[PDB]
Every structure is written in structure tokens, then in C-alpha cells.
Design a protein around this ligand. Structure first.
Ligand code: MA4
Length: 265
């Protein structure tokens, strides 16, 4: 694989799409690679990590409990509810909802949690309160994945999202237990985590949340590093490409390969 920046370029030329990428040291925030890092991309289900950070902030303040059971109705469900459709009789705890959103990309779970933080406006306000003046959520699942060309709704930038993820995981805005919980949910991703491990060399840590939307939109927010350590945040978004899902996944993986082959920078 070529140098990371060269691979990113090659991915744009092969997808005919825009890639946005950042690579950041988790502990310090040092930016190592940046490509279109101030350009907007749809978040898609990557927003679920920020969502759960807002839930955890409420827990830390005594305004929420991860134990609290929420009962909901079949008419509350939206497209793709693998966990939540199973619990119309017995409900789900707030923490179970978080786990379903982050580890399964359960859309109804995400909407249920969005309701608890004041909807898209409430989550956007939380972002502003942690110093992210760029990321915005405007819609609910699943309309937030529409990815209309040039539409600013439901977008982040790679730089914003990486900084925000670092703030949630490490800045002591959240309690120690809450930071640990958010991290564990990402470690526990079932959508992409196990597949990614199957193709990572021995020794490489992964935690992640992915997203997918229209017009080729695809993304991942990840922690990655050698020696079984979450050394770096890696944020990659794709938009406005007609390519197959397989090829979009391959190109994201190829950027990962470039990082692994050229890690010491
Ligand atoms: O010399 C470095 C390594 O080179 C290869 O490893 C390959 C591996 O065989 C391949 O499967 C992976 O694909 C990349 C898979 C990455 C998928 C997830 C990436 C995510 C992570 C962070 C967010 C962005 C994308 O590349 C590496 C590097 O070439 C060798 O197989 C391995 O023995 C050796 O240790």
C-alpha cells in the first residue's frame, strides 16, 4: 500500500467521490493526517457515538440512569430495529438502547435515545456545549441518511468529529465510568468490528462505529493502534460516489492498510 495521503487520493479517483479523513493521537489530539478535514460529510449512524455521549452526560448529572427501562410501542419503530423490535412487551433499558444503537446500529434505539436528549436540536446544543461549533443533527432516523448533494443537514467534518470523539472519551467532561462505558460500546460493535478484526494483523486494536447512507455515503469512526492499544482516532467519510458498497468498503479498508503499513509518523 502507498502512503496514507496517496491512498486517499487514489480512493477519490477510483470512486469518483469525496473522501474526508483524519488520523489523530487519542491521548494528545495531535493531528497526523488530514484530508478534506474541514469539509462537511453526512454522519449517518456515526452520530450514535455522540448521542450516547449526551446520554452519559445526563447520567453523570443525575438526570438519567442507564438502568431506566423505557417502554415503547410498535408505531415508534423505524426501519432496521434488530434489537428493539424484540422488546415491545418488556421494554429496554437506556443502557441497552445505547448498546443496540452503537453495537447493532438499531435505528429505533437511536430515535428513542434522541428523544431523551431533546431531539436533533438537543443533541446539537450538547455539541455546542462541548465546544463543537460545526457538527449538526437536524433529522431523525432514517431521514438523516439522505445525503443530498450540498445539504448541510446532519453533517460533521472529519476534524470536528475526531475532536468531539476525543473530548467524549478522554477529556473528563464525562465521568470515568461514563468514558469507560462509551469506549466499551465501540469495542463491542457487532456490525463491522468482528469483520475488521478478521483482516487486521495480529496486535491491532479496533473499536468503531460505522454508517451508510445514499449517493454512496459511507463512514467509520474508529480507534486503532498496534500493541493492542487504542492509539489513534481514525475518521473516514465518503460521499457522492456511485460505487458498490463492496468497493466503498474496500477503499476504506485500503486507507486502513496504508495506515498500518506506514504507522510511524
Ligand atoms: O506489514 C504490516 C502487515 O501487512 C499485512 O497486513 C495487511 C492485512 O493483511 C490486510 O488485511 C489489511 O487490510 C486493511 C484492513 C483494514 C480494515 C479496517 C480499517 C478501519 C480502521 C480505522 C478506521 C478506518 C478504517 O492491511 C494490512 C496492511 O497491508 C500483513 O498481512 C501482516 O502480516 C503485516 O503485519
Amino acid at each position: 500500500s502507498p502512503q496514507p495521503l496517496e491512498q486517499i487520493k487514489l480512493s477519490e479517483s477510483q470512486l469518483s467521490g469525496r473522501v474526508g479523513m483524519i488520523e489523530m493521537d487519542l491521548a494528545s489530539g495531535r493531528t497526523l493526517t488530514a484530508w478534506r478535514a474541514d469539509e462537511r460529510f453526512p454522519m449517518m449512524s456515526t452520530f450514535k457515538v455522540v448521542l450516547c455521549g449526551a446520554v452519559l452526560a445526563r447520567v453523570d448529572a443525575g438526570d438519567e440512569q442507564l438502568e431506566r427501562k423505557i417502554h415503547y410501542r410498535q408505531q415508534d419503530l423505524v426501519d432496521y430495529s434488530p434489537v428493539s423490535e424484540k422488546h415491545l412487551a418488556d421494554g429496554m433499558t437506556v443502557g441497552e438502547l445505547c448498546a443496540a444503537a452503537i453495537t447493532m446500529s438499531d435505528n429505533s434505539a437511536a430515535n428513542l435515545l434522541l428523544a431523551t436528549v431533546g431531539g436533533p436540536a438537543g443533541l446539537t446544543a450538547f455539541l455546542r456545549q462541548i465546544g463543537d461549533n460545526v457538527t449538526r443533527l437536524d433529522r431523525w432516523e432514517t431521514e438523516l441518511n439522505e445525503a443530498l448533494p450540498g445539504d448541510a443537514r446532519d453533517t460533521t467534518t472529519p476534524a470536528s468529529m475526531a475532536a468531539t470523539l476525543r473530548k467524549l472519551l478522554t477529556s473528563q467532561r464525562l465521568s470515568a465510568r461514563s468514558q469507560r462505558q462509551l469506549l466499551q460500546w465501540m469495542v463491542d460493535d457487532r456490525v463491522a468490528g468482528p469483520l475488521i478484526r478478521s483482516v487486521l494483523p495480529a496486535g491491532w486494536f479496533i473499536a468503531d462505529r460505522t454508517g451508510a447512507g445514499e449517493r454512496g455515503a459511507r463512514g467509520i469512526v474508529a480507534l486503532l493502534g498496534p500493541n493492542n492499544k487504542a492509539e489513534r482516532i481514525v475518521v473516514i467519510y465518503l460521499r457522492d460516489t456511485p460505487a458498490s458498497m463492496a468497493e466503498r468498503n474496500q477503499q476504506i479498508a485500503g486507507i486502513g492498510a496504508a495506515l498500518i503499513e506506514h504507522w510511524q509518523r
